[PDB]
Design a protein around this ligand. Structure first.
Ligand SMILES: OC[C@H]1O[C@@H](c2cc(O)c(Cl)cc2O)[C@H](O)[C@@H](O)[C@@H]1O
Ligand SMILES: OC[C@H]1O[C@@H](c2cc(O)c(Cl)cc2O)[C@H](O)[C@@H](O)[C@@H]1O
Lengths: 810, 810
């Protein structure tokens, strides 16, 4: 149908059809009379998978022969989403499969909806890893993603009576056609035990053993015939485990619980033992696999020339002392040489400055679980602090500030400090974030080793986040400037010469309207809710957190409602306000915010005087597959975190690429986005980081704002009195109390500027032509935020490898 | 190479080779450079599996269109063994695959050894179910095997210091290519809860739900293109199970433990709750599936015309009250009508008379776990005892004897009594066993309903137990009489006209010698033990139990050793005595018997004076795949259970079919075997059932035998003093004490006759020609013991269906 979706040749369509029928018969053991729609999905998936394997085998063969430097990306999260469409896009198979399935009497889009999301991440950090894998394959790097194959991913969110309910994400229930179990590469991982010192070094003995079994998933590059590997470990008990008899067999579950479930916290540290076991499990298995592959190329001098290990946050920080353990205890290298290799091999990416998100493990936990690693950590600390002492003699407070060991009630290890000490590069994820790191939390470290600190602004893959989810927009762009931009997003700048082109303006606007109509229909079909497709689609989708300030959005929504009630017969630009996202199960305040949103909807959506001028919808079960639907449909993107709290954001970039305008604070990547597009083409409001600092020094008093803003006072009084909860008048007392007395994120301080800025948004929306022209100026300058750019910078500036756009033979 | 293994046509071999290469590439994602031998096995398995699916789909389609009466065989055990070779044999693919793999540079037998046994059974009962499935498919019956997909089958047995060690049988580790998950047919099973009585009957409420997910395995008939289904249920937690968050997800294991492990007891009742849950789980899921299939053909009058349910022992006895529950509570049939349907549908096979093996469940367990079923059981009992009271007025002791409810310390339900009451047919498994049932334990029931009681003598499949495991013998037989006997074993009688044929005599003897040489080499290659291939192979392989009297064998072995030590330079027929089998983990005495066997070996095998004249080997990890190796190699089959204890035996039939002579008591099927071959061609010794009864009435005193048999006295003195355990002199005190004071199985009483009979065996072995002639007379009369005969009798006399040897189209 559309050009960017590839060729549907006679030979190709015929071959796809026969292979579809072969899989239905031989693989699924079905015929057309008994086949379910799910059987049809699987037949398609296996057919597409067949096209991957040839390239997969030849890619890994190519790496064996050429022996390039290998990049190992270690993460506890890979938020992959669905694989079928992505695979078709990257292999240029989409139109051919669409035609083939149509001729078989099937609708491909319907089959695509059957695939479960691979939900092995929480949000931004997990999705970044997924975008990064796509870009590394597209840029021809010999890269491997290593993680855990969780049996249960992020929970499915149900809303019951306005409250979030969690249910297990049993994503493997029907099987996963994309993964290949590799039980032959099973590796042992050790826990507990004790340390013995001999004549020939230390020995870690009396350990409990858990097996790590790898499952490999292919990662196709964009039309370059490269297929890299994501290797995910699964926990298995050894066969003599606990070996009355029946109980011993049932107790195997204990060991296998390591890979059972993803911790559902985003930007929050929960110091539970099972989480620590997960972190060591991934690191121990991965490092053995790395070293095995290195030896099959004795002399570890060349190790950093052939291996790069990227630590995604501090979660795999144990890679540093584990590498030291292997090099010193097992390979018998001297400490100083081992340390040189480790530092040159490892690099660390920081993703947050929130104190509650920083990993600080109790010494007593590491003592029992990983006694040898604790010893190595102490030795690293001693040697590091000796360097600090020599550099800044007599500065005793610096020594205590920089220590890997934090003293106090319980002694803890600061994992971020470990990562900096043992890595040759430390990077933040947006320019403002990387500056904050050097100025505040890692200032001491920056002073000691300034060369270590870098910036790598985040990006998103234009394959999933434009071509896949928004083919209509990708097509009208390709009509003007060709197809090269899909792997070279800077080419979108060429669209600036079309900002006054009336044909293009109409097309951009048409694509958005189509996206909005399709999404409006989806809301009725799957959730029975009626919305006006001509209204402004005002959307905030992201994890529910206090710092992300969904509450500030709520205040604006109520302001709009109160203004309509005050002057009903006055014209207002109609809005559909959509908010979605999951709350961590134990995060009470975030759960209360969800309830508030639904409660506001309950009042607003049923007020006759409001009509179809204002609607508030909570988007249930926000996840990658839902993002692919709602983002192309959005008009306004809400990126309203308190300045200095959102390290980067990536949702922001997705909205920019898909034709939404942004209302946002000067936080994270918003700063660089506004810089690229021009501040006049962005809706910037609120405190800058410097203004937040000034308020903190003076002392933040929310009462001041309540006293001086009558509209804000009305809302707080409505919340307190039970306007949005008539049967439970005091339901939102915790929210009001927090807002009034202990708001770390200064919601009130940005309220006036936010509401004023929102008025400017509504004004522009009244003029469709000038709204669309500003949209074009955004899309056209979004090129910097391709993860291809991000990965190219990592490759050149951290890993020491050159990216390549050259094809491998088909 | 050999005729019975089928044709290796040019077209077939070429096609197999290309499909092998396709699976290696596309299915396994490997090439010839990285492929492991296990990859080669899987490529072969997938290639052979492809040939099954066409026939599988068309068989199940045929059943849908023709709507025949369906046979449901319910068992907690299916001891299937390996599937690859069996599939090739039944599809006539063995020579073609052998040729194809040879041309690819691979040895097929080596690949066959890679397959794990499907060890989902304990011994005789589990293996009978497997033989039965083969025969039902071969006889063209619309039959379904229903059971549990245990994650862990029978434990692997390791011998350490002469002691049995158990390790988990992780048989699914590498995947199972034969099964097909059918998550679309997932069914809920209910546990616990309580009963509510309404206006419209009883209701079972507040239950805990476990999901039952089916996995289907194909069962090919012998060259008739029929492929039936074995459906095995796997336990799954529902997604809202327990739905802090992490613990709730980890607790899903509790529900899923139902299908985790096979209880490793054979012929022994362990009244554990998890076992009861397994028994209900299989029954509840199966019956819903049965009824679903029946409704898709309202009126349950025709139910018994379209459905037969065979209960394999009492393990699935809950099918009776579960069918009543469904019919009465859910379908709203009146009691009397529901009961008529149930009785006409169900039939029960008894497999034991041992009191310790009979299932007697505590009322308090059923009360908590299955409250509605207990109520139904009481009502069944009340109505049944009313019939007994009317038939035998005033006989109050009969009422208490026949009750389904046993009074005492703890009230129990006798599951065997339930089965008789609720089945239209009750059968034993050998003529003597079925007579014992009518005369002793079920005498009261036989008097009330004589028509109910039948015999169905057990059998074994001649596919696995001759063609597959002994191709050399199958071939020399086919040369003389053709190939028809493989599905018509009575044709072996034609071999009687060859008993004086010198060519045939030499061939039979040659095949045995070849089998013995191959097995002697196996013992060195995989277990580093040296044996003399010219010695008599004296083998007892079966589960270790007191009733099977491995101890009587031990006494004979020591007698032979003591006789050699007394007269070293006297000639004795050389023997290799092989004993193998697993002991239940909690069965202390059986574990002590294994230790005794190894201890005897330790002394005997290292005595220089003995030389290669006597060897004692314990066959480690006895299982189906090992049976296929050792049985064709045997000269003498030990079937020496105390008369009246072995219900049938099936190992006995396997040895008879494969050219071993039998030393045995007149117990189980031994009686019918001796009858078929002629008593002169069998080595029969010891007490008959009547002699055991006379001894019990008088009182068994073992001291009498000790006092009057000096050779027996010497052995007991050797055991007591520590001759076979010099470092632990009292190691075997428990064994001596049991033998002397509390031997339920009268080992001493048969010792003299056993030793005397063994002398006659040695005498015959000295004359190879007359030994072989007797062998021919055994093989020739083994036809009755084909499971095709057994199943034909079940079909005609119990199920009311006609078997068919007619092909379905290829
Ligand atoms: O860098 C990817 C994303 O990581 C997010 C992020 C950082 C973390 O440290 C953890 Cl544990 C989870 C997470 O989603 C940041 O909040 C977001 O600003 C950033 O865009
Ligand atoms: O009928 C099959 C076999 O079942 C055996 C047998 C009977 C049982 O009741 C149980 Cl629980 C397990 C078992 O293996 C009998 O001991 C044997 O004599 C018979 O040949």
């Amino acid at each position: 149908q559309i050009s960017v979706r590839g060729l549907a040749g006679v030979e190709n369509v015929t071959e796809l059809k026969k292979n579809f029928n072969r899989h239905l018969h031989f693989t699924l053991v079905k015929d057309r009379n008994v086949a379910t729609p799910r059987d049809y999905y699987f037949a398609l998936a296996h057919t597409v998978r067949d096209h991957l394997v040839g390239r997969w085998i030849r890619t890994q063969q190519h790496y064996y022969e050429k022996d390039p430097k290998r990049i190992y990306y270690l993460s506890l999260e890979f938020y992959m989403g669905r694989t079928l469409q992505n695979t078709m896009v990257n292999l240029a198979l989409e139109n051919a499969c669409d035609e083939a399935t149509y001729q078989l009497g099937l609708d491909m889009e319907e089959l695509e909806e059957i695939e479960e999301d691979a939900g092995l991440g929480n949000g931004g950090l997990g999705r970044l890893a997924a975008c990064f894998l796509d870009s590394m394959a597209t840029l021809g790097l010999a890269a491997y993603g290593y993680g855990i194959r969780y049996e249960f991913g992020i929970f499915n969110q149900k809303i019951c009576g306005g409250w979030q309910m969690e249910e297990a994400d049993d994503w493997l229930r029907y099987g996963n056609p994309w993964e290949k179990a590799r039980p032959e590469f099973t590796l042992p991982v050790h826990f507990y035990g004790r340390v013995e010192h001999t004549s020939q070094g230390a020995k870690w003995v009396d350990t409990q053993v858990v097996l790590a079994m790898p499952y490999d998933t292919p990662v196709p590059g964009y039309r370059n015939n490269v297929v890299n590997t994501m290797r995910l470990w699964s926990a298995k008990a050894p066969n003599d485990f606990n070996l009355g008899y029946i109980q011993a067999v049932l107790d195997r579950n204990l060991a296998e619980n390591i890979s059972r479930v993803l911790y559902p916290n985003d930007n929050f540290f929960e110091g539970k033992e099972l989480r620590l076991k997960q972190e060591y499990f991934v690191v121990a298995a991965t490092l053995q696999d790395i070293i095995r592959r290195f030896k099959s190329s004795t002399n570890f001098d060349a190790f950093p020339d052939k291996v790069a290990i990227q630590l995604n946050d501090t979660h795999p920080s144990l890679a540093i002392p584990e590498l030291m353990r292997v090099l010193v205890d097992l390979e018998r290298l001297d400490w100083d040489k081992a340390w040189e290799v480790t530092v040159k091999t490892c690099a660390y990416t920081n993703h947050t400055v929130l104190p509650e998100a920083l990993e600080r493990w109790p010494v007593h936990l590491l003592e029992t679980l990983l006694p040898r690693h604790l010893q190595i950590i102490y030795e690293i600390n001693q040697r590091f602090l000796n360097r600090v002492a020599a550099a800044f003699p007599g500065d005793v407070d610096r020594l205590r500030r920089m220590s890997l060991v934090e003293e106090g009630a319980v002694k803890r290890i600061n994992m971020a400090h470990l990562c900096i000490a043992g890595s040759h590069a430390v990077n933040g994820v947006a320019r403002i974030h990387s500056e904050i790191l050097k100025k505040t939390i890692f200032k001491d470290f920056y002073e000691l080793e300034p060369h270590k600190f870098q910036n790598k602004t985040n990006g998103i893959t234009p394959r999933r986040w434009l071509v896949l989810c928004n083919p209509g927009l990708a097509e009208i762009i390709a009509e003007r400037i060709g197809e090269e931009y899909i792997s070279d997003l800077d080419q979108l700048r060429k669209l600036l010469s079309y900002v006054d082109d009336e044909a293009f303006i109409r097309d951009v606007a048409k694509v958005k309207q189509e996206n909005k109509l399709k999404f409006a229909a989806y809301l009725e079909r799957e959730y029975k809710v009626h919305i006006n497709p001509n209204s402004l689609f005002d959307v905030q989708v992201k994890r529910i957190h206090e710092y992300k300030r969904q509450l500030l959005n709520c205040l604006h929504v109520i302001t709009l409602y109160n203004r309509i009630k005050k002057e009903p017969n006055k014209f207002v630009v109609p809005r559909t306000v959509m908010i979605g996202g999951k709350a961590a199960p134990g995060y009470h305040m975030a759960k209360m915010i969800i309830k508030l949103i639904t409660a506001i909807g309950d009042v607003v959506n049923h007020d006759p005087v409001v009509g179809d001028r204002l609607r508030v919808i909570f988007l249930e079960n926000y996840r990658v597959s839902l993002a692919e639907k709602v983002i192309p449909a959005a008009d306004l993107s809400e990126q309203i975190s308190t300045a200095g709290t959102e390290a980067s954001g990536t949702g922001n970039m997705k909205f920019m690429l898909n034709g939404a305008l942004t209302i946002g604070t000067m936080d994270g990547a918003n700063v660089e986005m506004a810089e690229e597009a021009g501040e006049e083409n962005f809706f910037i409001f609120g405190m800058r980081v410097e203004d937040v600092d000034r308020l903190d020094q003076r002392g933040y008093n929310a009462q001041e704002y309540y006293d001086r803003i009558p509209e804000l006072r009305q809302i707080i009084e409505q919340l307190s009195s039970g306007f949005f909860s008539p049967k439970q008048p005091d339901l939102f007392k915790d929210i009001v109390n927090m807002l009034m007395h202990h708001d770390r994120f200064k919601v009130f301080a940005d309220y006036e500027e936010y509401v004023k800025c929102q008025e400017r948004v509504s004004a522009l929306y009244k003029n469709p032509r000038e709204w669309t022209r500003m949209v074009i100026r955004n899309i056209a300058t979004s090129g910097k935020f391709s993860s291809d750019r991000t990965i190219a910078q990592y490759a050149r500036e951290i890993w020491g490898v050159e990216p390549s756009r050259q094809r491998l033979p088909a």
